[PDB]
Amino acid sequence: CVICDPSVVLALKSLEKDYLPGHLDAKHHKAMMERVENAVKDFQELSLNEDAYMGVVDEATLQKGSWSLLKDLKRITDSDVKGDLFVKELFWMLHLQKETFATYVARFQKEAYCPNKCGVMLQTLIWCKNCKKEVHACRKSYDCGERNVEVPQMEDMILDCELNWHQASEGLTDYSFYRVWGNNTETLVSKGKEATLTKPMVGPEDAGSYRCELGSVNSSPATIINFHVTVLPGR
Numbered sequence: 001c002v003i004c005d006p007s008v009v010l011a012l013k014s015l016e017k018d019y020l021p022g023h024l025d026a027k028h029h030k031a032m033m034e035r036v037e038n039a040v041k042d043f044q045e046l047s048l049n050e051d052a053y054m055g056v057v058d059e060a061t062l063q064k065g066s067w068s069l070l071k072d073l074k075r076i077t078d079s080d081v082k083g084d085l086f087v088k089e090l091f092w093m094l095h096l097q098k099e100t101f102a103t104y105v106a107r108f109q110k111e112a113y114c115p116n117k118c119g120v121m122l123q124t125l126i127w128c129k130n131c132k133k134e135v136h137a138c139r140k141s142y143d144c145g146e147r148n149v150e151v152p153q154m155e156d157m158i159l160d161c162e163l164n165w166h167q168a169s170e171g172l173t174d175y176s177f178y179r180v181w182g183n184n185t186e187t188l189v190s191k192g193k194e195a196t197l198t199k200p201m202v203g204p205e206d207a208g209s210y211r212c213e214l215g216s217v218n219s220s221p222a223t224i225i226n227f228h229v230t231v232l233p234g235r
């Protein structure tokens, strides 16, 4: 999907206009950029066993492909090779980088494709065929889990509602920390773009059960976590 990157096509324009003249006969100049640009546009068409091929990536993965690719092209041009060898090395490289990029696209589906064990993650994906963006809703468990927090008295209580994938989700509203009781009622204790609720000098009254809802834009919360806090008198 690499050609979906504005910098690759720049490197190609500069490749033809600035590197092709000095090092390639013009009898073969526009006739080669065809083969090349279609070899780049073929990165889209891959496959690797042990999985299918979603035909989709993320910015994080596109940037690796583009980088890893343009680095070696830079190796090529830096060498100043210019014969009927230039056209050999260029495409050997063009094969190998297809391999490497294929590995990248594998790691992406295996690990970074909807990596939430719970909640709703809005993940920006790029369709490789048409180089176009869509926001994909990754849906899993409603409530992520339950945290058991034990804290000694006079220590600081720290409730964390942040997960490894919140920094990568989108359309996120604030974190809200509510307080639940027997009253059946609950009072919002905190609300902001801080993923943690810290209450200093915890007491027997601070113990109980809290809840954290990470809001999303025009939707249900991305994450809900229930904290069960209990207090010890040690120290």
Ligand SMILES: *[C@@H]1O[C@H](CO)[C@@H](O)[C@H](O)[C@H]1NC(C)=O
Pocket: 181, 183, 185
């Ligand atoms: C729940 O308890 C708190 C403190 O005990 C109190 O402020 C609140 O009014 C209670 N809710 C009821 C009684 O509905």
